[PDB]
Amino acid sequence: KYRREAYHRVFVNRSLAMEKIKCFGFDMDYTLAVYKSPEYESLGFELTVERLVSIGYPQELLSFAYDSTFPTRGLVFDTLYGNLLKVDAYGNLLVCAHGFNFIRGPETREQYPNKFIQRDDTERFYILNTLFNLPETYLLACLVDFFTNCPRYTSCETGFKDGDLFMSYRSMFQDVRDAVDWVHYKGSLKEKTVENLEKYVVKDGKLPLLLSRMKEVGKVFLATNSDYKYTDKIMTYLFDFPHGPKPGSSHRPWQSYFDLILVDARKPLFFGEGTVLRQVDTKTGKLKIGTYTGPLQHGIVYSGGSSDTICDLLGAKGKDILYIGDHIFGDKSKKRQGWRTFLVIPELAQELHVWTDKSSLFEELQSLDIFLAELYKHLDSSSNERPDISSIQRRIKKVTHDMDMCYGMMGSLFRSGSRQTLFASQVMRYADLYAASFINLLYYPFSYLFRAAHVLMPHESTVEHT
Amino acid sequence: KYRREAYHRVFVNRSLAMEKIKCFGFDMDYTLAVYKSPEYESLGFELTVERLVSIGYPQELLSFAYDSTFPTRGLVFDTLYGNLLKVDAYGNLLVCAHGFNFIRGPETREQYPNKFIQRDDTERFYILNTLFNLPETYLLACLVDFFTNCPRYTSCETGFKDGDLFMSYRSMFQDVRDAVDWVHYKGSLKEKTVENLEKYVVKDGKLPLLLSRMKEVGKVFLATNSDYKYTDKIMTYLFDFPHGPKPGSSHRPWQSYFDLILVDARKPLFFGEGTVLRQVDTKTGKLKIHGIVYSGGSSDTICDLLGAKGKDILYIGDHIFGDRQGWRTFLVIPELAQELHVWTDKSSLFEELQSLDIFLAELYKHLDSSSNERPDISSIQRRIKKVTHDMDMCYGMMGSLFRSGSRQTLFASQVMRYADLYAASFINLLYYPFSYLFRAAHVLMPHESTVEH
Amino acid sequence: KYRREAYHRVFVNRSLAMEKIKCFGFDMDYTLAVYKSPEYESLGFELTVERLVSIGYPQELLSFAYDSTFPTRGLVFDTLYGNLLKVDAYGNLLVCAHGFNFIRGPETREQYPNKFIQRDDTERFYILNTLFNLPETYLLACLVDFFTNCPRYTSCETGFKDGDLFMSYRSMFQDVRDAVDWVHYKGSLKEKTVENLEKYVVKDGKLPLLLSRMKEVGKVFLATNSDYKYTDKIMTYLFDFPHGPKPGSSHRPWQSYFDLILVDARKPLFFGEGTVLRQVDTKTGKLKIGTYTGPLQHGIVYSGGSSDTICDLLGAKGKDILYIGDHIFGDKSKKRQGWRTFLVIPELAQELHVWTDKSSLFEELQSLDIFLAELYKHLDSSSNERPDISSIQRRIKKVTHDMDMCYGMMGSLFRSGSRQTLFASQVMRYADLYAASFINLLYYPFSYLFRAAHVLMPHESTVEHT
Amino acid sequence: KYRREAYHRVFVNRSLAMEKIKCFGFDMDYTLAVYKSPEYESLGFELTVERLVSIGYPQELLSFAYDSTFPTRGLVFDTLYGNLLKVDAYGNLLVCAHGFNFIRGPETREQYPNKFIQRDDTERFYILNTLFNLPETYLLACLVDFFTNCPRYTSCETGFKDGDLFMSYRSMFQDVRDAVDWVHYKGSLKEKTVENLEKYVVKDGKLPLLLSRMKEVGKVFLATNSDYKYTDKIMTYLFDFPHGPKPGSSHRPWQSYFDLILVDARKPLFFGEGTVLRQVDTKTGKLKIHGIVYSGGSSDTICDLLGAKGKDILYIGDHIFGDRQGWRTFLVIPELAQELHVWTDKSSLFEELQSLDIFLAELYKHLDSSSNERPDISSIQRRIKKVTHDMDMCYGMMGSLFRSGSRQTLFASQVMRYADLYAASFINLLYYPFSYLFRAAHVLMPHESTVEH
Ligand SMILES: c1ccc(-c2cccc(-n3ccnc3)c2)cc1
Ligand SMILES: c1ccc(-c2cccc(-n3ccnc3)c2)cc1
Ligand SMILES: c1ccc(-c2cccc(-n3ccnc3)c2)cc1
Ligand SMILES: c1ccc(-c2cccc(-n3ccnc3)c2)cc1
Ligand SMILES: [Mg+2]
Ligand SMILES: [Mg+2]
Ligand SMILES: [Mg+2]
Ligand SMILES: [Mg+2]
Ligand SMILES: [Mg+2]
Ligand SMILES: [Mg+2]
Ligand SMILES: [Mg+2]
Ligand SMILES: [Mg+2]
C-alpha cells in the first residue's frame, strides 16, 4: 500500500472525496497562525500569573515558570477535589495528579470509587481541550501544589483555609479561568504577541502556495473569532515573504487570497443563530453603520453573521465545505447541513516522533507480551500451574513508563497503555480529517479520495482472515 | 504471538488478572441458558403477534413469519418517522430502513439532515440492545411495511390513517413494546419453552465441567431475573446428563454447583438499591414469611454474603448495563460465532477489497496539489461498493452487528465500554487457566494503524 | 369596605399572609434607589446618542432631546419593520407607530394581517420591559423617524439604503441595544449619576423608618446586580439624613440595616445556578481571594452566588421570602422553592392620578354607553331599525383619545380602551403585590393579610347576584 | 345601564358591530346540535369503557357509572404523576386530584414544588378542553382511583404494577385517549345517537326562527367536521317541527336555511391548508368523482364562494381554536347557564363572603407598621374557607369552570383570548338586533377595581 511519509500525512476517520469540495474555510488562531511552543504558552502563563497576583494572589506565584513537559491537552479538572485527571473515552481515570503528586493505584478509590468520573457533570468537571488551556493546565497544578505545601494555609478536602476564609478549588479555578480570559480580552497578550511576531508565530512559505492552489479549484474563506485589527497584523506577517504564491512571483496582499473574509464570528454561536452580519471598515477598524446585502464581489470584510451566511454568499452547502481548524466543536447537528472537518493537531508531530525513534521500546513490549503467551500456551482450566510472571510484569511497567515520559509527564495526548484518551475519542468524533498541520494538504491532489482507516475491535485485530 | 483457536477465544477490552478473581457470577437467560436460534425468536415473534391481534390489530398480522436473516441486534427505532436505524458510535446513520425499503443515499437528508441522530432523545429513539428485542426488531419493520403498503391504510410522515383514525408510529411502537412485555410476564412464553426444552434450549456437557472447576478456585453464584420455578426447570435441563462434572462421575443436582443462588433479582435495580432480601422455599416455590436460595436483594447482599469486594467479582452475562464498588464483566455475545465465521470463510472478499484499495493508492501515488490529473476511479468505486454489499449480505440484511463499512456500530462501542471480557459463549473459559492474565488489545487510531516503527 | 387611600395602597393579585413572612429582600436600582424622571432617562438618552454618533451615526442625532411624553413601558419593537407596537395580553396590536407616525386602522393589516403578532418570536420582536428601556424606546422611534425623512437615505420595507450599504432595522436596533449596554457598563452613566445624586436620585426619610421596622419582625437582605463601589455610593446617599430610623435617633450606616448584603448577583442567572459565592473586601472594593463559608455573622458583604445561598444563610425558604423589586422576571419555576414578589411600578402614581382627576371623562363615557343601551333597548332580531349611532360613536373616540393623551402619547401602561396591555398581564403573572413604591408597606401592619382582588370576566361583571 | 335578562345575554370580550357582518358560520356538534346532559356524556363513557375492556382492561371497569357532578371542562391531566389538575391562567395549581383523593395543601409541593406547571410541556400535560373530553375526564380519575385502591395492583409514583408488569399513567392515558377516538371514528357512538335522537339531542323551535332571520340580512353556511349522512340525520331532527321558521309557516327542509353547506371539514386543518374541495352526492351519500353541499376544502374556499373577507365573518361554535385573514368568533359555552344560576341563586353566600371581607378590613383599619396588634382572625379565616367550599360544591366537585377562589381558570383565559362573543347558546342572538353594536366589558386590574373616581 503506497503511503506518503508520516510527517506529510493526512489521516482519515471518515472517508472524503476531495473532488466534491467546493470551499475551503479557515480558522486563524492555531490554524493558519501557529503559535510557537513553548514561547507562546509561557507568555500566557506569565500574563495570567501577573494578573492573579495583582488581584491578590500570593507573590510566590511571581516566581513560577511555565514547564512545557508537564501538561497534555484534554485533561479534566475536578473543581471539587482539585485534581487534574487523564481519562479514557468512557470516564475511567488513567492519571490523577493532585498538584505534582500523582495519586495512582488503590488510593484513587477513596475519592473516585470505581476509578470513574461522570463526565456529564459540567459543574464539577472541566475539560481542558483547547491549546489555549495549556498555560492554565500547568498553572492549576502549580497553585494546588503551592497552597498544599505552604504553611500559612490549611489543606482540606475541597480547598484551603486561611483564617476564617475558605478558598474552594472551585473558586480558585474560577479565578484562573477568569484571569486567562482577561488576559486574552483586556490584557496584553495580543499586543505582546504582535510586538514580537517572529518569537511567537511560525511562518511558512508554502502557506501562500497552498492557498493559491486551493483558490484555483474552489472558493476559500476566512472565519476567525479574532477582530480585524489583530487578524490583519497576523495575516500580514504570515504572508510577509519577499514573494507571492511561489518564489519568483510578486507579493500579493493576504486579502487577495480569500474569496471571503469574516472576523468576529463568535464561534460556536456562529454555527447556530450567530449574530447580525456586519461589515468592517478597513481604514478605521470599526464597523460600517450599514453593511452590503449584495452578492460575492470582494474588497469586502465581514463581521459576525452565521455559517449559513457563508453558504449563502459562496452558494455552497455544508457537505461541499471543508472547514480547517484547531478547535473541536460539538453537535451534527441542528437541521442545517454541516461542513466537513479537517482538524489540526499540532502535538501530532511529537506524537509521531515517539512512535518512530522509540521503536526499541515497542518491540520489547511486543516480545514481553509474546513471552507471556508462551508461559500460558499449553494450559487450560484443568491445569493448576500458577506461573510466576511478576518479574515480567514489573518490567512492562518500566518500559511503558519510560515510553510515557517521552511524551510529557501526563503522557500521550491520545493513548495510555492500551487505552484511548477522551481526547482521542473527541477527535475521532468531530474530525473527518486530521494532521499536524493543514499544510499537509500540499502533498495530496484535489482529486484525492480519502478512505477512512478501519478501527478494529479486539476480535477483529487478533483474528486473521485465513 | 501464540493465540488459541478463534472459536475458543476470550477477547479482551480491559486487562484482567484471573488469578485475583474470588467469585464468578452468572446470569441465566441467554447466558447459562442459551436459547436456540431461530426457534426461540420465532416463538416470541408468534406469541407477540397473537397478542397484538387479540387486542385489536389486523388479522393479516397472523400470517407473518419471523425471518432471522433480517434483524441484527442494536438497531435504533425512530418512533417519529418509523425507521429502523443502524448508526455508528457517535450517531451517524449507516442504514435506514422504513418497513423493508432501505432509504439511504441523498434521500436520507430529507428526514435526517446531517445523516445524524441524537441518542440523547430517549423520547424519540429506542435502542434495541437485547437478544429479546430480536423478534420485535423484525416485527417493527413488518408492521411498518404492512401498514405502508396496505390499501386499507394511508401513509403519513409520522404514522398511518385507518379512514381518518390516526396511529402514530410512537403509539404503534409502544403497543409492540407492551406486547412483548406482556408475553414475557403474563403470556405463555415461559411455559411453551419448558414444555419443549430440547427444541428451545442448548445444552453442553461442558457446563458442569466449567462450573465445577470454577468452584474449586472461588465462589460461584447465580443471580437471575427469573423466578425459582422457571430457573428450576431450566437449570435442571441444563444439567441433565447421565454423568456429573465429567463423564464417569455421578450426577449432582444443579444447586450443588453454586455457593449462592438468587432469583427475582430485578436487575438493573439489583445493582442499585435492589429490593428486600427474601428467602425461597424450594418445596412450595413460594417465599418464606447455609442451605441456599434467595429472592430479591442487592449486589451488596451478594458481596456481604460471600465476603468479596467489587473488583474481585467476575460477573458473566448477556446484558449490557450502564454506569459503591462495581464488578468486572464478562459479556456473552452469541452472534460472535457467526460474526467470526464471515471474517474467516470470506478471505477472498477481504483481500479483494485489500487489493482494490492498494490499487487506488497507486493511481494517486506520484500526485500532489500541483497535479491536474483526475484519474477515473468510478469502476473501482462501484466494484468496491458491490464487494462490501456482498460481504454485508453474509451477515444478514442489516449487516454486521459490530461494523458497517469502515465504521463501528453503536453496539460495538457499547461492548468496548461495558465489557472487560467478551466471547461467543462463557464456556470458552474452559480453555484458559485461572492463573491467566488477560491483556487488552490496543484499539488504534488511524495515525497509529497506518504508521509503522 | 375600609380602604387606605390610593397613593398609599398596596395592590394584591394573589393573597399573601404577611405574618408568615420571615425575610424581606430588596432590589436596589429603581427599587430602593428611585431615579428621578425625566432627569435620569434624559441622561441615558444623551449618553447613548453620544455613543452612537462617536461610532459613526449622523450628527443630527446630537440635537435630539429626550421627550418623556412619548414612551410607555412595555412596548414591542419589530426589528423587521421598525415599528413600536403596543399589544394586548394575547398579541393583538393596539398601537403601531413607525417613527412618529401612528399607522392605525386598516393600513395595519398590510404588515400585520389579523392585526396580530406572534409574541413568541424572540428573534423578530423585542419587549421593552425595564425602566432602563425608556431612553432607547424613544430613541428608536427617533432614529426611524430621522432616517425616514432624511433625503440622503432611501426608505425600504426593512431598513434604509445609502449607496450600496443597507442598514436593516434589526442592525440599527442592535447598535442601539449595544450602545445602552456600553453606556451602563463602560460609559459614564454611573459616574455622572454619583457626581450629582440630588439631581438623579430620590431620597426619603421614611426609607430607614420602614427597613428598621422590618428588621424587628424578620430578616432583611440586599441583592443587587450593581457592584459594591456603586451600591455604596448609592446606599450612603439614600441614608444620608441628619438622623437614623426616626427623627431624634442617631445616624447609623446603611449596612447596619441589612442582615445580609449581596452584590454582583447576576440576576436572573442568580435565581438559577447562579455564580460562585464570593466575598467583597470593603476597603479596596475588590473580592477577597477566600470567602467565609460560615453562618450569618455580619460585617460581611457577598458577591455572586445564588438565591439558594440566601435561603441557606437566612435559614428560610421561598414562600417565607418577600422579594421587592422593579423588574418582572419569569418562570415558577424549576424545582427549588420560589420567593413571593412585591413589584414596584413607579408609573403607577401618574396612572392613579388620571384615574382620579379625570373623573369627568369616565362619567361621560359611562353615560355615552348608557345611552346606546337605550337606543337598542326595545329591539331584537325581528326589528329592522338601523339606529344611527355614528354621532355618538365618534364622540367616544375623542373622549378616549383625550383620556389617552393624559397618560402619554402611547397611552396607559396597563390599558387601552377596553383592553389590557401585555404589560398588565405580565404584572398580574409575576407579581403577588404591587404599588408605586415599596414604601407603601409603611401603612400596613406586619400582621396584615393581603386578599387578592377578583378579576371579573364579562359575564361576572355585568351580571348582579340578586 | 339597560341590560337584557341574564340567561338571554350575549357577553362581549372584544367589541363587534353586528351591522358589518356578512356571513354567519355554524359548527354543528355541540353548537347547532346540543347533546343532552348527562345522557350523552354517559353514552360516551360506557362505549369508551366497553372498548377498553375489549382490548384487555379489567372487567371491574364495566361497572363504573358516569357521574356528572365530578368533572368540569378544561382540566389538565399530568401523565407523569397521574393527576387531574385545575390550574389558573398562568399555570398555578388550584386543585389537584389523584383518583378521587384531592391532594392540595402543603403536601402538593412534594410533587409540584412551587405549586406550578409548565403548560408548554405537551409531552407531559394534556389540556382537556372540549365537551367530548368530559367522559374521559371522569374516566381518568376512575381508573387512577381503581388501580390505586385495588389489591391486585401496587401503586407507583408514575404508574402501577400488575405483578411486576408496569403500566405508566402516560401509557394508560394514551389508551384512554385512543379509546374515545376509536369510539367516535369506528365505534357506535354516532349510530346509538341517531337511533334515539330525542334522548340525546336538544331541539328548539327557535333554531329556524334565528337562522331564517339571519339569512335575510347575510349569508349562512354550515361548516361541520361530521359527514353528510350523520349531518343529514342530525340536521333533519333539529328542524323537524310541524311548522317552518315561525308557527303557521310550512316546513322547509334544513338545507334551505343555508347558503352553503360543508361537511368532512377537518378543522383545525380546515383553517390552514385544508384539503381538496369535493362535492357530495346527496342521493348516494358518497362523493362525486348553486345546488349546494361540499366536502373538505378550506376556510378560503368559504370566503371565495360567498365573496366575504375574514373580518366580515362571524363563526359560531363550541370549540376554542388557536392562532391570511381570520373570522370573528362566537363561542358557545353550555355550562354557562348553570354557572350563571349559582351566581344568582346563591346571593346569600356571596354577601356573606362580602361581609366577611368587610369585617377584616375593620380589624386592620387603624393599623400600620408601628402597630404590635396581631388580631386573631382564624375563625373568620376558617369560616371564609367553608363558605367558598360550599359555594364550589354548587358547581360540581372540581368547582366552577371559570374561577376558583379569587383566581380565573386556564379555561377562562382561553375564552377571553379566543372568543369575541360568548353565551350559553347561540340562540341568544334572537334577542339582539342585527344593527346591535357589542361593546367589550372592561376586565379590571386590582388597582382599577378597588379605586374609585
Ligand atoms: C485496563 C486497560 C488496559 C490495561 C493494560 C494495558 C496494557 C498492559 C497491561 N498490563 C496489565 C498487567 N500487565 C500488563 C494492562 C490494564 C487495565
Ligand atoms: C464511512 C464509512 C465507511 C466508508 C467507506 C468504507 C469503504 C470504502 C469507502 N469508499 C469510499 C469511497 N470509495 C470507497 C468508504 C466511508 C465513510
Ligand atoms: C376590541 C376591543 C375593544 C373595543 C372597544 C373598547 C371600547 C369601546 C369600543 N367601541 C367600539 C366602537 N365604539 C366604541 C371598542 C374594540 C375592539
Ligand atoms: C389565590 C386565590 C384565591 C385566594 C383567596 C380567595 C378568597 C379568600 C382568601 N383568603 C386567604 C386568606 N384568607 C382568605 C384567599 C388566595 C390566593
Ligand atoms: Mg482556532
Ligand atoms: Mg503544542
Ligand atoms: Mg440474561
Ligand atoms: Mg465495567
Ligand atoms: Mg432593579
Ligand atoms: Mg417613570
Ligand atoms: Mg363542534
Ligand atoms: Mg379570534
From Swiss-Prot, chains B, D:
Its cofactor is Mg(2+). Mg(2+) binds at D27, D29, D318. Binds 1 Mg(2+) ion per subunit. The modification Phosphoserine is found at S379. Its EC number is 3.1.3.5, 3.1.3.99, 2.7.1.77. P(1),P(4)-bis(5'-adenosyl) tetraphosphate binds at N129, Q414, Y418. GO terms for molecular function: 5'-nucleotidase activity; ATP binding; GMP 5'-nucleotidase activity; identical protein binding; IMP 5'-nucleotidase activity; metal ion binding; nucleoside phosphotransferase activity; ubiquitin protein ligase activity. IMP binds at D27, D29, R177, D181, K190, T224, N225, S226, K267. Allosterically activated by various compounds including ATP, 2,3-BPG/2,3-Bisphosphoglyceric acid and Ap4A/P1,P4-bis(5'-adenosyl) tetraphosphate. Binding of an allosteric activator is a prerequisiste to magnesium and substrate binding. Inhibited by inorganic phosphate. One of its GO terms (cellular component) is cytoplasm. It is found in: Cytoplasm, Cytosol. It comes from the Eukaryota. ATP binds at R119, N129, Q414, R417. Adenosine 1 binds at N129, Q414. Keywords: Allosteric enzyme, ATP-binding, Cytoplasm, Disease variant, Hereditary spastic paraplegia, Hydrolase, Magnesium, Metal-binding, Neurodegeneration, Nucleotide metabolism, Nucleotide-binding, Phosphoprotein, Transferase. Adenosine 2 binds at M397. GMP binds at D27, D29, R177, D181, K190, T224, N225, K267. (2R)-2,3-bisphosphoglycerate binds at R119, Y418. Its main location: cytoplasm. The keyword Nucleotide-binding applies. DATP binds at R119, N129, Q414, R417. It is linked to Spastic paraplegia 45, autosomal recessive: A form of spastic paraplegia, a neurodegenerative disorder characterized by a slow, gradual, progressive weakness and spasticity of the lower limbs. Rate of progression and the severity of symptoms are quite variable. Initial symptoms may include difficulty with balance, weakness and stiffness in the legs, muscle spasms, and dragging the toes when walking. In some forms of the disorder, bladder symptoms (such as incontinence) may appear, or the weakness and stiffness may spread to other parts of the body. Homotetramer. Belongs to the 5'(3')-deoxyribonucleotidase family. This is Cytosolic purine 5'-nucleotidase. The gene is NT5C2.
